[PDB]
Amino acid sequence: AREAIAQMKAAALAGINSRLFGLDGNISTNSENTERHTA
């Protein structure tokens, strides 16, 4: 049975790419403006 177990564990895991990062929360698509308006 020691063989058959390892065959199961290996058969049920393939293609799963770990990729320890998820996604970052910090977005900056465009920097902050910091300018004014007048008439």
């Binding site: 990729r19 320890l20 998820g22 929360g25």
Partner: protein, 168 residues
């Protein structure tokens, strides 16, 4: 037969034909490495920060150890940058005893993190045991979505690299 690592006959600087500059007394010169960087503040500035803060809270008592400790946990779970405002808080029992926020920052001679690299092993052991009991993770990590529960040890704003860390 035995000898020492450096020898006078090694090639060395030669300003004068006779006199050598690097005096061979280095065999006992072993300062702890981390104390020498630039990314850490001085021994002086850390001291004055600890003295100047005490007046503006006006404690003059050893409750300061609690207040300092009450700061570092909050210093984990939210960012560290000069653009903070509002308040901060530690809790006891079930209430939310708060405090002000300004004088810690503005009476910080270089920037904040430039002081707070001292706290490396303290918070390390802290999240270690809290991870031992229950599955802990800070906010600085959850905001950036790590999958490996194991590397909570290395999630801070303030964390000082050394030659001791692993290559992972």
């Amino acid at each position: 037969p035995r000898l020492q690592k450096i020898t006078k006959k090694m090639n060395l600087p030669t300003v004068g034909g006779k006199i050598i500059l690097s005096l061979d007394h280095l065999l006992e010169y072993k300062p702890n490495q981390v104390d020498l960087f630039n990314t850490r503040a001085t021994k002086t500035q850390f001291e004055s920060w600890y003295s100047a803060v005490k007046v503006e809270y006006d404690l003059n008592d050893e409750q300061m150890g609690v207040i300092m400790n009450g700061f570092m946990v909050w210093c984990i779970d939210n960012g560290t940058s000069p653009d903070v405002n509002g308040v901060w808080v530690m809790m006891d029992g079930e209430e939310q005893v708060e405090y002000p926020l300004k004088p810690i920052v503005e009476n910080a001679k270089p920037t904040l993190r430039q002081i707070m690299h001292h706290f490396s092993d303290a918070a390390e052991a802290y999240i270690e045991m809290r991870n031992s009991e229950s599955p802990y993770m800070p906010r600085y990590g959850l905001l950036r979505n790590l999958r490996d529960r194991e590397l909570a040890r290395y999630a801070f704003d303030f964390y000082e690299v050394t030659s001791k860390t692993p290559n992972r």
